[PDB]
Write a protein that binds this ligand. Structure first.
Ligand SMILES: COc1nc(Nc2ccc(C#N)c(OCCC(C)C)c2)nc(OCCN2CCOCC2)n1
Lengths: 554, 412
């Protein structure tokens, strides 16, 4: 007898003000009972459970379920009530590693623990709260009582305690073996090293003995799992990673759930397969509650999907992260508020890829979207590699300079360089900060009757030029935008425009290159065509001379 | 040696707050730091039975190369009960904002002696994250009074008094205030004498049992307040007068007797923007009267220790920033401007962060509490980059204004 160290139990409480589960034990068939009695018998023999007396008020229902209609039966206990009534644990399964963040190893091995798991004892004072009863045959006898001495399978607090304990155990062995690396997921431990393979095998052996010291049984034979590993949607080789292969379904009738699963597969494959376009398909899913309704593929969706299936034609591999080399992210504009990025170390070997869709605004510009994408990639890169990448961006230094210097908001991008890979991101117009000498002065106004939705838009100038246009089915904001649009249409290459609209000014100081409103876009095109434009504001109804409320208030 | 009883408000549970990503160097620094903090018993490793979490990160103070552990306690601070001590509240030293000079000192280490209430510790839990979620996040809890928590200065107040008893009596001129981990020392004396008395004070701190060798020099008497000014020109264009009228019309929301009539009348007809308009008698007189109105302070502006403080910040470009502190719209308790170039010349966010810091410190000196900020920055950008530039131990609440303000130039 070589002594094994005890595993410290984790104190557990029920949610305050509440108590444990009470549920009437469901009647079974004689068969199910006869199976469960044997199962619980040998479990009791192994120490996973124990027989208890009538003193325990708590009963959780126990079910029998045949395993694949074989000669074996298996126990299934429904803990949902206890889980509802049990406290919260800090769940350290928060997040999972991303393969791109890992460093390659010459050797990697899996150690399954389905043994050590039940070597982890439950808190003694909490044991009475897990209690199940096996109904005897015919109910002619008092049912058999049982309680858990270890972490039950499917209890709310099992994973956290399991992982905390396991970590506590692995702690010094990791510390005194700095030349290897370990990661724990579910029932599997993952060890890796750059050691010569024999040394690796003996290291794994040493780990197995180390777990044996706490009385944790390890397979004692060769493990059936070797690289590649299928893990959480990934195919993991020691020198490379990818996603478990993505194949786009060919169907004539595309339903809502079809495009749901399609955007799932695409958003999942986007991290590696570069240039995946989710836009048109996602737009077809907007506002659709019913999963059974077939929604016709737009002609903009088909040629997108045709590029998608030509992306997934031949698979591509991601590499691992080498801390000795620079970290770089490159961005491209795909148009339509979509951006595609690739994070790599050496050219054309990508650590990973990705995409960014614009936030939903009324208006927006390229530069803002580029900035937002940069922030996204930054945060992602801090999560994964722990540092901020070097950016290669489709924007001239000068453009960025003008933008951030003149922009009303504070804005920043980390260290970056201009890559010339069209389409380039640019500023489409720039408003003068001073009134233009020699340029005609257009005083514009618009107004609308709120009751009849009728109104007018127009302008008067210093050169005598005037216009007023009637508008039906329109609003004050609309008429006041239309006024400016008119002043832009009818004016030469340089123009000064006075407006009383805080709204129009509010829109134009946001410098959008695109908008939901075709009117605003028309104005944008107009500005783009212009040489110099000075937009000036005055308060309404203060009788500012030249601002004419009399023509459009009729 | 005896812990003072501490609890939360009724119905409010402990903070469960997401830990945001940290870079590698900050993770290293926090690992080393928490390692040395465990060996000193200030913190202790915890198990899965502790659900609560509070964010933690790393900074560097003024002109110092040593990393510092900053726990962001805001959620816990607002979830912890309003702590009214034996002090019955501090009658905040309005003499502090009147002082010729004020020095800010870091006393935080003094908190690490006093033990924390045994039952309250589960609410202080924080997590040192790992890169790429490869290893489980390391978890500690505080056995002592944590820096950044509202209850720490509250608890340590009574003993801080009897620590500072001889000094306050030896120097009846000097005013001493305490906010979070910082201690503010006001005086009417000279800079050199200030430095000497500060050295004596930190030695006095070292003798009473407690990086406290740092200090910050502020000058409330030289501090920035602003009135509203209108141009003085010998000739006005149509544009000049349009801007003027706009600004006056804006000021009318504040000052009662503003009249724009005679100035607006000049604009009559549609003139070109660059055309010069001579000022009439009525116009000039009206302008003069408006200036007269503007020279006076604002009628009946009162502070309310109950109500919130709000801080608006506008980017004026060229490193220039303007700001206002208020409670109700168009009542300004403080207004100012910040031009500082230090390390920030090419970076807007660094500037804005230093601006928020300065403004907050000012708020602390004047009213003894921090304002609620409205920042001219996208939530994503700020939230990404602010912790890199942050040198102060406290943190203010904030929000993000997405609409460009028209009033931007009216403060410039
Ligand atoms: C098992 O843990 C671990 N694994 C690796 N690499 C590594 C490389 C190849 C495979 C395969 N197949 C692998 O598989 C085991 C793990 C999982 C996630 C299935 C893991 N690198 C590390 O360490 C990288 C941590 N560094 C990141 C940069 O800062 C310093 C720390 N840790």
């Amino acid at each position: 007898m070589v002594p094994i160290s005890p595993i410290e139990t984790v104190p557990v409480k029920l949610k305050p003000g509440m108590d444990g589960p009470k549920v009437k034990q469901w009647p079974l068939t004689e068969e199910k009972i006869k199976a469960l009695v044997e199962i619980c018998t040998e479990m009791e023999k192994e120490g996973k459970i124990s027989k208890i007396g009538p003193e325990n008020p708590y009963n959780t229902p126990v079910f029998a379920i045949k395993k694949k209609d074989s000669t074996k039966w298996r126990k299934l206990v429904d803990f949902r009530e206890l889980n509802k009534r049990t406290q919260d644990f800090w769940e350290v399964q928060l997040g999972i590693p991303h393969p791109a963040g890992l460093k390659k190893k010459k050797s990697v091995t899996v150690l399954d623990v389905g043994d050590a798991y039940f070597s982890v004892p439950l808190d003694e004072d909490f044991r009475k709260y897990t209690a199940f009863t096996i109904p005897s045959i015919n109910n002619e006898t008092p049912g058999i009582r049982y309680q858990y001495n270890v972490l039950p399978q499917g209890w709310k607090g099992s994973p956290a305690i399991f992982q905390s304990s396991m970590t506590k155990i692995l702690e010094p062995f990791a510390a005194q073996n700095p030349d290897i690396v370990i990661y724990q997921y579910m029932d599997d431990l993952y060890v890796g090293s750059d050691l010569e393979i024999g040394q690796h095998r003996t290291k794994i052996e040493e780990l197995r003995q180390h777990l044996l010291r706490w009385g944790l049984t390890t397979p004692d034979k060769k493990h059936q799992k070797e690289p590649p590993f299928l893990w959480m949607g990934y195919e993991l080789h020691p020198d490379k990673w990818t996603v478990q292969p993505i194949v786009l379904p060919e169907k004539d009738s595309w339903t809502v759930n079809d495009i749901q699963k399609l955007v799932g597969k695409l958003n999942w494959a986007s991290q590696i397969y570069p240039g995946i376009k989710v836009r048109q398909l996602s737009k077809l899913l907007r506002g659709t509650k019913a999963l059974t309704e077939v929604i016709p593929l737009t002609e903009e969706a088909e040629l997108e999907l045709a590029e998608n299936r030509e992306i997934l034609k031949e698979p591509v591999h991601g590499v691992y992260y080498d801390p000795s080399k620079d970290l770089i992210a490159e961005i491209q504009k795909q148009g339509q508020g979509q951006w595609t990025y690739q994070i790599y170390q050496e050219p054309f070997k990508n650590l990973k890829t990705g995409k960014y869709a614009r936030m939903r605004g009324a208006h927006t510009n390229d530069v803002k979207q580029l900035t937002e994408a940069v922030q996204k990639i930054t945060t992602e890169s801090i999560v994964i590699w722990g540092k901020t990448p070097k950016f290669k961006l489709p924007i001239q230094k000068e453009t960025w300079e003008t933008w951030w210097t003149e922009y009303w908001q504070a804005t920043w991008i980390p260290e970056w360089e201009f890559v010339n890979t069209p389409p380039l991101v640019k500023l489409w117009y720039q408003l003068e900060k001073e009134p233009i000498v020699g340029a005609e002065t257009f005083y514009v106004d618009g107004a609308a009757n709120r009751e009849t939705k009728l109104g007018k838009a127009g302008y008067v100038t210093n050169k005598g030029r005037q216009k007023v246009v009637p508008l039906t089915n329109t609003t004050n904001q609309k008429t006041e935008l239309q006024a400016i649009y008119l002043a832009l249409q009818d004016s030469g290459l340089e123009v000064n425009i006075v407006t009383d609209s805080q709204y129009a000014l509010g829109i134009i100081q946001a410098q959008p290159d695109k908008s939901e409103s075709e009117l605003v876009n028309q104005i944008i095109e107009q500005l783009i065509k212009k040489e110099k434009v000075y937009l000036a504001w005055v308060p309404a109804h203060k009788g500012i001379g030249g601002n004419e409320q009399v023509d459009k208030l009729v | 040696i005896e812990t003072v009883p501490v609890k939360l408000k009724p119905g409010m549970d402990g903070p469960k707050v997401k830990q945001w990503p940290l870079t590698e160097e900050k993770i290293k620094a926090l690992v080393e730091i928490c390692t040395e903090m465990e060996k000193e018993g200030k913190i202790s490793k915890i198990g899965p039975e502790n659900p609560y979490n509070t964010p933690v990160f790393a900074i560097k103070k003024k002109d110092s190369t040593k990393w510092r552990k900053l726990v962001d306690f805001r959620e816990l601070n607002k979830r912890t009960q309003d702590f009214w001590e034996v002090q019955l509240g501090i009658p905040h030293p309005a003499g502090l904002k009147k002082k010729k000079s004020v020095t800010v000192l870091d006393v935080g280490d003094a908190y690490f002696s006093v033990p924390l209430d045994e039952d309250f510790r589960k609410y202080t839990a924080f997590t040192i994250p790992s890169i790429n979620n490869e290893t489980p996040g390391i978890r500690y809890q505080y056995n002592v009074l944590p820096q950044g928590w509202k209850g720490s200065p509250a608890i340590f107040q009574s003993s801080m008094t009897k620590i500072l008893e001889p000094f306050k009596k030896q120097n009846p001129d000097i005013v001493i205030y305490q906010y979070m981990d910082d201690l503010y020392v006001g005086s009417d004396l000279e800079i050199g004498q200030h430095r000497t008395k500060i050295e004596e004070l930190r030695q006095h701190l070292l003798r009473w049992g407690l990086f406290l060798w740092m200090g910050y020099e502020l000058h409330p008497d030289k501090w920035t307040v602003q009135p509203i000014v209108l141009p003085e020109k010998d000739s006005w264009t149509v544009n000049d007068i349009q801007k003027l009228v706009g600004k006056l019309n804006w000021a009318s929301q504040i000052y009662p007797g503003i009249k724009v009539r005679q100035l607006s009348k000049l604009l009559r007809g549609t003139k070109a923007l660059t055309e010069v308009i001579p000022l009439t008698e009525e116009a000039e007189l009206e302008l003069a009267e408006n200036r007269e109105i503007l020279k006076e302070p604002v009628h009946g502006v009162y502070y309310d220790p109950s109500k919130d403080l709000i801080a608006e910040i506008q980017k004026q470009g060229q490193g220039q920033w303007t700001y206002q502190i208020y409670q109700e719209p168009f009542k300004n308790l403080k207004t100012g401007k910040y031009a500082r170039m230090r390390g920030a010349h090419t970076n807007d966010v660094k500037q804005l962060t230093e601006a928020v810091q300065k403004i907050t410190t000012e708020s602390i000196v004047i009213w003894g509490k921090t304002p609620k900020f409205k920042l001219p920055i996208q939530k994503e950008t700020w939230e990404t980059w602010w912790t890199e530039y942050w040198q102060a131990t406290w943190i203010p609440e904030w929000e993000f204004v997405n609409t460009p303000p028209l009033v931007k130039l009216w403060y410039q």
